[PDB]
């Protein structure tokens with residue numbers, strides 16, 4: 172299963188919002204300008220695909236979601252991926268989809284530590300993967 176990451180785990184330094192966005196944008200070939208835009212759940216779904224290909228129902232992800240009920244659908248896809256891979260993290264979905272900075276920044280700081288603990292260096296085509 173996945174390597175879990177806890178508050179007590181030894182991890183890299185937290186990233187600035189600028190450096191976190193750079194990671195997201197460069198890794199996934201996106202152009203987010205705000206951490207709040209992670210409220211859509213789609214980037215997290217793709218990072219899960221990148222970590223564990225086949226863990227996520229990529230075809231069901233709404234990459235161009237603009238409505239909160241769509242953000243929730245994307246996070247349920249992510250939650251199913253976490254369950255499949257034995258990730259013991261509860262996603263505060265109700266908070267994230269509202270677009271508030273602190274909630275979204277807190278979760279992406281954890282998720283980047285999770286990612287770094289699990290990523291194997293595989294090549295990945297995030298554009299080809301969004302079809």
Ligand code: MOO
Nearest residue numbers: 186187188189190
């Ligand atoms: O000054 Mo920050 O580390 O982007 O919240």
